[PDB]
Point group: none
């Protein structure tokens, strides 16, 4: 087995388009996801026009579920600008945004109404998205974070792409040209 | 391209080598990425700037990794730096489980190290002291993953912040998009 | 980009050809994984390029596998080389000792006594020594590893990362601080 990914069987559903969907499974607590967030955002700006990026928050343990809720609350609140902010506050600023109370405090700090945040954070719509989220994470057999799902048929990750067999031969080829000269 | 590249370290860390700009590589023997980059770091150090010194610092994100910190300093104390890179090979290629003193000592003895000597140095206060300092250094630099580099006590960079995933997963994602379009 | 220099560079014993060495171990699942690709690659390589596969041993327990490699080549049964990988990793056959190895070869048309004699021949012993010597000179730390022109070393793991980039940042940061 030399491939740098695995097939998702049975394949996952679509998003009614003709758009190749890419899913980035992340977690606000994951330093790797934090480090890569700006790369992913930048990548999305130049992605092929028939491709859509969907970032899905995951929870490997009960304590992570609130991080999922947070993600959706920010989206429903129409403040996607705060999304990358959560990473920075957590990883760069060392802020303990691990429970509703703490998150809400930070949310208000960013200009959000606590009352609205509170209600939206508990909304049945958010609770559903979270289910769907972990649900997708399960259908993808997520090994960790970050993890990527493509077209619902392929799943890859930093670890799965670690060994580049064909790549090594390709480098060997470059080296040959280098020593010949 | 979207890659942070590095981050500032605050407060800045003063060099522990008078007259030298320090480059600290935080690593762990159990880390696949550290094992993979070791020969490149070593090669890199051979041509490094004269006013620069490289130091390798074993980190521990949990207690169970502490023995691995102790191992790094013990080999240096025993003056067998030659075994340092071999540790990576043993764990990652020979799949030897050197995660405890007993397993380590056995391995050490297999490499011509006197078991009694190893067992002794491993618990030396010198080693214990350096292990404490390693973790304090890792903390001051807010290291959250390996490998990681602290430069001039002012910056912290890592392959991940430098865009390492563009050669891996992200490269595979672009390739997977093409394949699903087929 | 993703490669390490071999210091000092190894002398060439193939004038007029760029030598590529693949350090492998039959027990290595990654070497098993890439073997098919390496052979395909060899068929189309540049005419002034030559590939040599070198069995490596990190511990004593791995020497028999080196012996096996040179024994199959001495028996002129290169066809059995790729089969060792699949036999071990796909078929799960425990080909880890001369006896198990001889038996396995016997079922492939090889004269069992000829296998046993070549396996312990002075000739095979010499080549196993040279291999270990080459491994030491190239400072090989894992498998599979590729040495090119006796000067460079790269591998699947390095090719799957941008460690050189990470270090370049370090270089620039060194300059930044010194200011």
């Amino acid at each position: 087995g030399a491939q740098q990914y695995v097939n998702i069987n049975p394949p996952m559903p679509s998003d009614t388009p003709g758009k190749i969907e890419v899913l980035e499974f992340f977690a606000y607590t994951c330093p790797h996801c934090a480090a890569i967030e700006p790369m992913v955002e930048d990548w999305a700006k130049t992605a092929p026009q028939d491709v859509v990026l969907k970032q899905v928050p995951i929870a490997f343990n009960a304590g992570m579920k609130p991080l999922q809720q947070l993600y959706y609350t920010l989206q429903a609140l129409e403040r996607p600008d705060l999304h990358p902010k959560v990473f920075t506050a957590i990883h760069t600023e060392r802020k303990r945004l691990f429970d509703k109370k703490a998150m809400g405090e930070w949310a208000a700090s960013q200009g959000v109404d606590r009352a609205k945040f509170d209600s939206v954070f508990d909304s049945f719509s958010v609770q559903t998205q979270v289910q769907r989220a972990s649900q997708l994470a399960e259908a993808a057999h997520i090994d960790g974070t970050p993890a990527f799902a493509v077209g619902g048929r392929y799943m890859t990750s930093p670890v799965l792409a670690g060994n580049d067999y064909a790549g090594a031969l390709k480098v060997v080829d470059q080296l040959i040209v280098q020593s010949r000269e």
